[PDB]
Amino acid sequence: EFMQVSFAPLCPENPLQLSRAQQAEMMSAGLGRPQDSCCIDLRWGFFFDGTNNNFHRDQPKKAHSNVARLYDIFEADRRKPEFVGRYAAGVGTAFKDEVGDQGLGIQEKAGLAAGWGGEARICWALLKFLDNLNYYFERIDLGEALGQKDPATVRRMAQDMTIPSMELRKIAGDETEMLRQISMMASLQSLTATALNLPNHRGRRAVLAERRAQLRQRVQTWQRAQPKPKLRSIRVSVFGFSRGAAEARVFCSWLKDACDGGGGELTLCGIPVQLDLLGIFDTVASVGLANSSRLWSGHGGYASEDDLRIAPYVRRCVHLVAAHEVRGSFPLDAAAGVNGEEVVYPGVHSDVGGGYEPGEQGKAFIGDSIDDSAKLSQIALCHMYREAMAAGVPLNLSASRLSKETKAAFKVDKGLIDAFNGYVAATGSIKASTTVALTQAHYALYLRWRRLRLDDTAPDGMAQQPFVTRARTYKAQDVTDLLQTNAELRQEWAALQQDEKDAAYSSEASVAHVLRSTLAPIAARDDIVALVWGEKMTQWREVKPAWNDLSPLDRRIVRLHDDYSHDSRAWFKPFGAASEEAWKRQYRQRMNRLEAQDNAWQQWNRDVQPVIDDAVRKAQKHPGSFQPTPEVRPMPPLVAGQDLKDLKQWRSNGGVIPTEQDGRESYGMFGFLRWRTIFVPEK
């Protein structure tokens, strides 16, 4: 039983069409068998969205993820209560009636920065697991039938919902986030005192055991009253993206807590439970601040190494991973130990899990029109759809309840199919056998694309390409992201070419200056700067051969990166404003303040000017008075420096808000000239 590694297969001409083998698998899964016989199989899907992915918030802009899209088409038919799908919002977004996560304020920042709220979402889905069986019998969830609101129940189950707001403030702070990145990058134990905030394992099990006892009495009552049809089995499938894939894995490990009292094969109220498919997109944990180990590795809180291991009763795991994701905040957690496939896909994190809005960064165009069907992540979506159908998951694209918009989310433009398959064909000779080697080989080709597009005065520069022209028509901030990030890559390379001349660390190294300038908590700790510097130079030497490879790149590879894949380092601004809307709000607030401060000074000037003129005319009339100057009211503070320049421009141009120019991960520590960090399971 093992995870076979490969690159993405060619996308079929109809990506929703099952292969002959997959159509056989679907039939043997039981989907389609009848209730005419004595028995029934319940089929339950659990869908955990990724960081800052929220289905109802993001579907209107067609930016809902591949997890949300598959959930949307899971059967929700009042005539089929045996099929139940449940959706957990991504961390950093609202999940309020479910767990009490408001998705604003410090709760939002802690969820985005550190995965806070993931434990609570797993606990909620474990309650839903019990609710699903009550719903079969009674058409109402069990907590609702008991008058028990889910947030209060989850708070008895989940440590993260008890963390005090002042502690959440610490977890989310800017400087704390710099320290987490340094700890991740340099394998450094925390320099500051931190809290572990481990899961409330005992409370979670205790709550599930009492909830399960309430469930068992009802199930036994209804089975006695009406034993037909017999409940033959419960078939579970679990899907996740990003931190939702870390949650999905830990949910599979903790599913034992919701099933009948331990001892052999999983059952619920005597009914066999089987886990037919774990379908996960690019697993990223990066949770918490520390754990009980020497190396935190992003494996804090619920996301321990032990529980991230694919649970042994997972019958099939399909893990689609992003070949070209390289952000330091998004290390990959590889999956092994069960039957299935780990398949490397082109693009960055949300080119595989979904979630870009069509048109962002000038991608997902058909001619000059924005079109969701041309989004790269549509290919991986259909791959997971075919695997879910083959595993017996009751996704129903034909259901009459479905919206036009819901069904259009599974459309795939033939131009994207051709560009995707051209990429696969151009790289078919690579043939690496592990996920680390396969991703590094495809990232090496990406680096050669970046070098091709590096000189933004030249015809082959990124700035001169059609996708940047399209980005300009879509959103000014996207162009700034793209081109500022290319400028930062020129700086990254120049700093490394300078610093590689001397293998020994110096305080005057270029990269050292970058680190001190961008990482305030360690700017006075030259020894820590030296440690980060040493790892950065090691990473450069790893990728230098690819970056320096000036052999022509296959045209098919260039086209995919120009027109389909996104640049996730470019837009990700953990040290900028919380969002573009927040950036704009803060600029308007700053200008409003500067206007008030200037209107206060100008009004002082007009009150004082007559007094100063009057003292002049008098000294002219009596040049001998020692006319000492008159005292006036205290002068309000002067708008000066950059503040005055911005205010002047703001008045002149009528209120144009400049785009946000920086805020990305430091290129002195992460940047493009590195390999993505990938944790490969213990064996």
Numbering used by the authors: 35 to 717
Give the exact sentences the study uses for this entry.
Using biochemical, structural, and physiological analyses, we determined TleB as a phospholipase that mediates interspecies microbial competition in X. oryzae. Here, we demonstrate that the T6SS-secreted phospholipase TleB acts as a cross-kingdom dual-functional effector, mediating both interbacterial competition and host manipulation. T6SS effector TleB functions as a phospholipase with Ser240-Asp280-His347 catalytic triad. It hydrolyzes lecithin, exhibits toxicity to E. coli neutralized by immunity proteins TliA/TliB, and enhances bacterial competition against E. coli and P. syringae.
The structure adopts a shovel-like shape, with overall dimensions of ~120 × 58 × 65 Å. Structural analysis reveals two primary domains: a phospholipase catalytic module and a C-terminal domain. The catalytic module, characterized by about 40% sequence conservation and a low 1.3 Å root-mean-square deviation, adopts a compact α/β mixed hydrolase fold comprising one central β-sheet of 8 β-strands surrounded by 14 α-helices and 2 310-helices. Consistent with other phospholipases (such as Tle1PA and Tle1EAEC), TleB also harbors a highly conserved catalytic triad (Ser240, Asp280, and His347). Conversely, the C-terminal domain with an unknown function diverges more significantly in structure, comprising helices and loops that form a shovel-like shape with the “shovelhead” over the catalytic pocket and “handle” formed by long helices. This crystallographic analysis delineates TleB’s domain architecture, highlighting a conserved phospholipase module and a distinct C-terminal domain. Two TleB mutants, TleBS240A and TleBH347A, were constructed by substituting alanine for the predicted catalytic residues S240 and H347, respectively. Our analysis revealed that while wild-type TleB efficiently hydrolyzed lecithin, its mutants failed to do so, indicative of abolished activity. The detection of enzymatic products (C18H32O2 and C16H32O2) highlights TleB with dual PLA1 and PLA2 phospholipase activities. TleB demonstrated strong affinity for phosphatidylserine (PS), alongside phosphoinositides PI 3-monophosphate (PI3P), PI4P, PI5P, and PI (3, 5)P2, while exhibiting weaker interactions with other lipids like phosphatidic acid (PA) and PI (3,4,5)P3 and PI (4, 5)P2.
